[PDB]
Amino acid sequence: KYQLPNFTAETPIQNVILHEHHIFLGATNYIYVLNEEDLQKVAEYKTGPVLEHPDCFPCQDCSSKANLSGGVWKDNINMALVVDTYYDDQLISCGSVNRGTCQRHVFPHNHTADIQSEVHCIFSPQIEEPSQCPDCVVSALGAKVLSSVKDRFINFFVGNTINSSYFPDHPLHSISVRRLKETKDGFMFLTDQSYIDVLPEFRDSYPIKYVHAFESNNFIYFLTVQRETLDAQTFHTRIIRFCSINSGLHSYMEMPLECILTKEVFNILQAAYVSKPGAQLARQIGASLNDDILFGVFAQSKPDSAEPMDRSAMCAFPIKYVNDFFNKINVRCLQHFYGPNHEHCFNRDEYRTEFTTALQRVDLFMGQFSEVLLTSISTFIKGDLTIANLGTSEGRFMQVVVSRSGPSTPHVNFLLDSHPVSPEVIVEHTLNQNGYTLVITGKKITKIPLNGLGCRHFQSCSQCLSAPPFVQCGWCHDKCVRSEECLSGTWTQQICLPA
Amino acid sequence: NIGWMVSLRYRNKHICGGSLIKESWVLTARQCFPSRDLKDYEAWLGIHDVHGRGDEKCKQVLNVSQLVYGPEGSDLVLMKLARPAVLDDFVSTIDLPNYGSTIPEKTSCSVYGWGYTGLINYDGLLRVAHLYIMGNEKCSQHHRGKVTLNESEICAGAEKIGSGPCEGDYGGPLVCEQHKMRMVLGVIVPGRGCAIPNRPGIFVRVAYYAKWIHKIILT
Amino acid sequence: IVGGYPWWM
Ligand SMILES: *[C@@H]1O[C@H](CO)[C@@H](O[C@@H]2O[C@H](CO)[C@@H](O)[C@H](O)[C@H]2NC(C)=O)[C@H](O[C@@H]2O[C@@H](C)[C@@H](O)[C@@H](O)[C@@H]2O)[C@H]1NC(C)=O
User: Which residues form each disulfide bond in the chain (chain B)?
Assistant: First the structure.
């Protein structure tokens, strides 16, 4: 039980963004602005509920139409939250309402907390090809948004979950790339290769979940949870990779990912975090100190389903070695996009690839979390060490050392909230790696420090001396404390006698 | 006259501006190329109107044979025409600055394009904006320290009012007078927002890439 | 060209 900076929203928090010492929370019907220091609410923006109407088009406020004959009230579930610093500093928010439209919140010159003064809706009426909706960005069933400045333009890599729900003039794409017009008035697709969608025949039978998305070495990566095959009854985790070109999705290849236990397959990814390795771990897995490593939290599947079994494993995939496997040549055509029997498959940028063999790694915690469901992960370096901030389905938060050779006891281990921990994380590194972590639990956000959570929790001399050096713990006759707080003076970090 | 202004067409629609620097060579930007298929592209010369309405007696439609991409840093691309353009009173070539060259701050420049205007009913006739060269120190200060400027970049901004290039103007020129001669000093590339009052435009410095340009054009 | 004039200016 700890007294840490905390904030409780009226509605559940979906997204979190940090910009210029402020915490931006993408929650249901609200965007909250919090102070970085004490998590105190500085401002709020009401994004909902929104009154939906087929006649009242996106981005236009139908407040008068509340007294209708065909209008419905819908909750604005925040699907995406982004800070654009390339153009005039602004916050981009995309919600489930108004066919997944986005809106930019322009910050006044010296007031980051002001998210009310200048709000522009990103929607332009289509005249060239009304069959396409580039401003219809986000899906309500699930959406992952990754933005990046590419070729002097802000690009939006959007992964959307889809079902057979047909929408005329305003449809949604599975994996796509669109750029903001320099006028800031709307998005636009460049070619027909700017999107890769599931065939109408498999839209409901083949669901796709976009768990994580990142940009590394000019490549765009998407982490997916989808069926092993179109006709398969079991689920899979796939890594999606494509060329970071504005013009479209080039060199699109998808290979499976597996987290094995010495053979036990943790086929379903719950959360992912990309970061550099610690000196010890770098050497352990054959990686440089400047190498990007995909840290994936995986879980065993309920037979023939996608829901997890409360059995987890975590293994590291260095992006260098990930690319090595993509370059290595066996290979199948993209079955959800192309016909499973069409001419493109009977051949061999233009063509879409699907790998048959999975890239696999052994659980770095060596079956330590094989009895719990891990729902959150964020990695960080402290000296030679690599530490993982772990979230559980029970609401447990923990900090534990990551090492290829043997698991460790978590230094921090406590019940944060009754609600599971959100995969939406933030790690801040302030001068000499002594920063914090922003952890979500339902409608609560907590600021946990990176240098541990005290010392007085270690019951025995064994647990006290097993603690990493940055915690600066030591045994003082009967209590685990810091050097400066040892009454008697019998303070050691080396010897445990029969106490 | 402005006979060097090229209009790059993608799928029979104007996508970008360009500068005719040699009879078979057009200097444009990489952002103008969505497709890798050079059949979908066409170059229009000797036009004042975007749709080439009142200039059929001057219009020189040409196909694109090669695409030569500039060094990694530059957003430049040298475009080879399948046939050399015939020079007359309506079609001419623009001069390039020498490799180790510069122009001082306050040098009067012009940007040309058939791009976005903001106007309700735009006629489609070629437009100009009068900008003035700004030094890379004042430019970074005017940009509120959001971007550090390389040697490969050139700054120019209009006086007090909000004016400059936008969507559809990319690849086009920043024409300035050097040594009693009109030269292409920059190339229109996507900026950090269109025509913001007191915000100068960042263009790719042609003088910096002049050595690479003469390597490709001289054949 | 935003805030521009016809080419002959
Ligand atoms: C929906 O709200 C409207 C107001 O925003 C109502 O109309 C407005 O009602 C006012 C009285 O409450 C009246 O002074 C306004 O002139 C009127 N505005 C317009 C443009 O009609 C509307 O229905 C009205 O209210 C009821 C009580 C009756 O007076 C009707 O004749 C009005 O149209 C509201 N409808 C419902 C279903 O509540």
Answer: 16-32, 109-176, 139-155, 166-194
